[PDB]
């Protein structure tokens, strides 16, 4: 048979990769960071509480100015906040109220959103007449939009429940590159600092590293036991952290091509909904289903702090580009800025 | 001129919060529903009786606004996108009365999901006319797929239409008891199940959803006052 021959060849290649990964595992990140000074206790306080959303918030994204931020709620609204003054800059009504993701362009001229409508919508914020209007609707996904991130004003990467990722040309509206290989719902993606690579997390307990220009999967990472819900790149671009429904966060390295650290605890039996790094990458902030956000020491896997201000499931969190504040969105319709 | 920008930002924020107050009236008045079905269940005919990833249907009953949503181009994996509907008034679960065992497993997953624990389910046991013709004929016995049907008796609290024979009443009430065993096993007062024997072309389906939604909102208000 050929099916049994192609399957048996997969077990041979999987054993070869598992042995190549075990050869490089000379030490553990816990052993090399066993002597460094821990960060103590990180006790952040709620500085701002952004109210105005009517339903659960599913996503938020900071602007590149570390002041403005966009948030998406399932009431059908995109609200752009001025986190310094808590004033609302824009309130964009959406065609489909089932939004699941949002993005802020690096230039600050565009915001994106999408969800169960299987469409990524682009909204121009600097139009001449002054009314925020949809600039482009990117159709082509056969599943719900789960995440989207701007490469520039004319490029965007999307992840959907159709088990694929896509790179779009906003002016034309066409998929320039389609990233296939996942066998489950792709839930999150994270762009590298140079925007030449991005990692995706799906419901197959696997994470993949994609090349944006070449459109190929370079590395496939395993280790999680359940669906990966969140993913974030390390500040340098040589590592990334994942949050899954197995109540664990795991740190993966690109050059070592394997997992380095597990961030878990016996009393945590709820899935992770969001992950983010600090400016230096020392703190790994994770949002959980138990309404809490835990601040992990990324180098030592120690719990360094807890953010317990929300009354419902924390759905999204994000750190500013200057590292001054952390924003957290939750199903209780509130956004909180922590310092 | 920093005071000129800070006053222009407060004026724009006041105009936004004025529009958000109007949107809160429309949002809090509309009752959102999720229509879920199975393989060849008949939900499309109920929608017909009043690319795209989700379909919306708006209708009014006694001046009350209803917004029913039907899933379109989504894969058969539901464990992720079904969490979006944790705040709907009710989930309309249409079942064609082994596709029946598959609907029971799907009903169990919806009933016991941690995010849908506070969401009620309006159960439409559809295709009751086709169930009668199959039982009256007698070609395929339900006992071959449900061995407990041979030991089942029609409950005394049943309300059979005087036209149908006890064989059809015993068959359709056994299927209802299969779903009620799931609902009564984990029903602690957060949510309830409203079963109905429906046909896809019935004009009573819209009134059934209205009456069940009024019961759900009533029980929600009674729970806020801790009366029930």
């Amino acid at each position, epitope marked *: 048979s050929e099916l049994d021959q192609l399957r048996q060849e997969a077990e041979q290649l999987k054993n070869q990769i598992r042995d190549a990964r075990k050869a490089c595992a000379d030490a553990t990140l816990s052993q090399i960071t066993n002597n460094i000074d821990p960060v103590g206790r990180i006790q952040m306080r709620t500085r701002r509480t952004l109210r105005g959303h009517l339903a659960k918030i599913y996503a938020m994204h900071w602007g590149t100015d570390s002041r403005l931020l966009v948030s998406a709620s399932q009431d059908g609204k995109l609200i752009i906040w001025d986190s310094y003054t808590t004033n609302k800059v824009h309130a964009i009504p959406l065609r489909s109220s089932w939004v699941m993701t949002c993005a802020y362009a690096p230039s600050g001229n565009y915001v994106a959103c999408g969800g169960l409508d299987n469409i990524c919508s682009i909204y121009n914020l600097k139009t001449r007449e002054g009314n925020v209007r949809v600039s482009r609707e990117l159709a082509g996904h056969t599943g719900y939009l789960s995440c989207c991130r701007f490469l520039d004003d004319n490029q965007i990467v999307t992840s959907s429940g159709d088990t694929t990722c896509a790179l779009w040309d906003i002016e034309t509206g066409q998929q320039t590159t389609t990233f296939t290989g996942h066998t489950g719902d792709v839930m999150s993606l994270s762009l590298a600092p140079d925007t030449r690579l991005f990692v995706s997390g799906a419901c197959d307990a696997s994470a993949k590293l994609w090349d944006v220009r070449e459109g190929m999967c370079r590395q496939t990472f395993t280790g999680h036991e359940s669906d990966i819900n969140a993913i974030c790149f390390f500040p340098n671009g040589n590592a990334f952290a994942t949050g899954s429904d197995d109540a664990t966060c795991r740190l993966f390295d690109l050059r070592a091509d394997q997992e380095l650290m597990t961030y878990s605890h016996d009393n945590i*039996i709820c899935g992770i909904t969001s992950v983010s790094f600090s400016k230096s990458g020392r703190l790994l902030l994770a949002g959980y289903d138990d309404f809490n956000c835990n601040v992990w020491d990324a180098l030592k896997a120690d719990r360094a702090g807890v953010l317990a201000g929300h009354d419902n499931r924390v759905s999204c969190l994000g750190v500013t580009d200057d590292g001054m504040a952390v924003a957290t969105g939750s199903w209780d319709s509130f956004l909180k800025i922590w310092n | 001129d920093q005071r000129n920008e800070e006053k222009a930002q407060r004026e724009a924020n006041k105009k936004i919060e004025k529009q958000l107050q109007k949107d809160k009236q429309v949002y809090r008045a509309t009752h959102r529903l999720l229509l879920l079905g199975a393989g060849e269940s008949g939900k499309n005919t109920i929608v017909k009786q009043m690319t795209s990833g989700i379909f919306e249907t708006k209708f009014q009953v006694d001046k009350v606004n209803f917004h029913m949503f039907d899933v379109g181009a989504q894969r058969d994996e539901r464990r992720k996108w079904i969490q979006c509907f944790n705040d709907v008034t009710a989930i309309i679960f249409v079942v064609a009365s082994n596709r029946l065992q598959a609907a029971l497993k799907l009903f169990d997953s919806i009933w016991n999901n941690k995010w849908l624990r506070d969401t009620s389910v309006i159960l439409f046991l559809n295709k009751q006319d086709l169930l009668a013709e199959k039982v009256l004929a007698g070609k395929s016995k339900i006992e071959d797929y449900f061995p407990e049907f041979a030991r089942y008796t029609t409950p005394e609290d049943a309300t059979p239409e005087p036209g149908e024979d006890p064989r059809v009443t015993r068959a359709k009430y056994f299927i209802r008891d299969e779903f009620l065993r799931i609902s009564t096993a984990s029903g602690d007062g957060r949510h309830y199940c409203y079963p109905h024997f429906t046909c896809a072309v019935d004009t009573e389906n819209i009134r059934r959803v209205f009456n069940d939604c009024r019961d759900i909102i009533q029980r929600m208000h009674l729970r806020q006052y801790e009366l029930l």
Partner: nanobody
Amino acid sequence: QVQLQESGGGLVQPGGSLRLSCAASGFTFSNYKMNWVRQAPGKGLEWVSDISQSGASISYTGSVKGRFTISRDNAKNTLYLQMNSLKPEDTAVYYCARCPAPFTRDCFDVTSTTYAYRGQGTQVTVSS
């Protein structure tokens, strides 16, 4: 990596017995509810039996109740299915399916066309 490998299976006479074994690896076996699904020739995937984390709660589909017996050994990370008095209706590829999330009463999408936490399946044919 989550791995489910189904063993057993083969040709059996009508009325015979078979025992299927599911060797699990890559996850905490005690934290997940396990399932058995099968795909008959020219038919879709059909749920057969499931067992809770501890083994107390056990449910079967109607067509196999009284003939099939499911059991789990959390020490050996193995799922078992004892099939007695087999009929030609039981001819199918039997898959070992795991619930997606741990510590969950609900078990979604175990009978989906594409599901990650499911084995490749073992062939069971009942013919004379």
